Amino acid sequence: EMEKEFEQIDKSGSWAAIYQDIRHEASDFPCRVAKLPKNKNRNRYRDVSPFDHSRIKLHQEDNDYINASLIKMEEAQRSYILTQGPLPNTCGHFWEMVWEQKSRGVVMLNRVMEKGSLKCAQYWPQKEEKEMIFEDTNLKLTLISEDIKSYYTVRQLELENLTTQETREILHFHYTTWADFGVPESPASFLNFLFKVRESGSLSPEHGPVVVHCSAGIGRSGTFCLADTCLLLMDKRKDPSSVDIKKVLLEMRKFRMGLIQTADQLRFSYLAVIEGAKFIMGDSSVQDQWKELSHED
Ligand code: VO4
């Protein structure tokens, strides 16, 4: 049981050892396509690649490679696409993937510039009047509106397939204060943001998988997905004790390497899930408590 275990681990100060054990037991699968010489400029990081078996394939005849993985959580019945922050040459691929996979939301957990370096291309328009056209993939992207809060921004984008002129609404959920290799300010702040993604409909099974990224797409993205999946699992059963956080993370790591980069992110994942359990088990008022504690104004 997560809460009991949580305090056992805190008591011993053994989060590094627990986290290390998950690293040691995690799956190892080939990333042959990612390592092909022609894909070198499609990878942001040399050591972060999608497994071949779970990689997202673009629907183009030329080169179908993107650094993106489908995390298909069978028992929870939820899927996510975890991907790196697009590069200047992969922004067209990124939006092509959003289109072909029928995603409704994009969750971005990083800033474009972090610690003085460019962690992510400016892949969406910052101004209504300056829309973006990705000529390589024949897509057009327009900012429709923006709702700026203290630590996150929600954007309403319109994505158009120029070949067919069909248009779709994409919701962009942008957490702007979550540092690389860091943890959110509080369980409340993280959960307030997670429930706004859930309260967008973007995670619904009638849509394609939500796209989740930060810079590499494994650490903050892993944390976000682990908490969400764990809450969903106990929601389906209405049974918080049936959820094994470490086994869920190991299951997720069969689909993308390196999910959760630090032991404190794992520890934070426990915190977020334990706190979110109060909502799942019937205390609806906690949701407004999180919003207050998050100080989004
Ligand atoms: O850009 V990350 O170090 O949260 O995978």
13 in a known ligand binding site: no
Resolution of the deposited coordinates, in angstroms? 2.1
CA of 179 to the centre of ligand 1 (A): 9
Pick the atom of ligand 1 nearest to 48's CA: 5
Amino acid at 167: T
User: Which residues does 247 contact at the CB level (< 8 Å), separation at least 6?
Assistant: none
User: Which residues does 194 contact at the CB level (< 8 Å), separation at least 6?
Assistant: 224, 227, 228, 231, 272, 276
Domains of the chain: 1-297 (3.90.190.10)
- For atom 1 of ligand 1, the residue with the nearest CA is 215
Amino acid at 160: E
Sort 114 into a burial class: Cβ within 10 Å, 0-12 / 13-18 / 19+.
middle
Pick the atom of ligand 1 nearest to 261's CA: 3
* Residue 83 near residue 217 (C-beta atoms within 8 A): yes
Q: 15-25 and 2-12 are packed helices; what angle lies between their axes, rounded to 10 degrees?
A: 120
Closest CA to 212 of 54, 93, 85, 31: 85
- For atom 2 of ligand 1, the residue with the nearest CA is 219
CA of 45 to the centre of ligand 1 (A): 10
22 in a known ligand binding site: no
User: Which residues does 178 contact at the CB level (< 8 Å), separation at least 6?
Assistant: 109, 110, 184, 214, 220
CA of 85 to the centre of ligand 1 (A): 9
Classify 68 in phi/psi space as left (phi over 0), alpha (psi -120 to 50) or beta.
Answer: beta
261 in a known ligand binding site: yes
The approach used to solve this structure was X-ray
Pick the atom of ligand 1 nearest to 215's CA: 1
Question: Is the C-beta atom of 228 inside 6 A of ligand 1?
Answer: no
CA 30 → CA 35, 102, 199, distances in Å? 10, 27, 36
* CA distance linking residue 177 with residue 185, whole number of Å: 8
Token pair of 17 as six digits? 């050892």
CA of 264 to the centre of ligand 1 (A): 14
Question: Is the C-beta atom of 83 inside 6 A of ligand 1?
Answer: no
Pocket test for ligand 1, best of 215, 224, 269 (most atoms within 8 A of CB): 215
239 in a known ligand binding site: no
Pairing of strands 78-83, 105-108: unpaired
The DSSP output letter for 163 is T
Amino acid at 62: D
SS (H, E, C) 190-207: HHHHHHHHHCCCCCCCCC
Active-site annotation, residues: 214
120 in a known ligand binding site: no
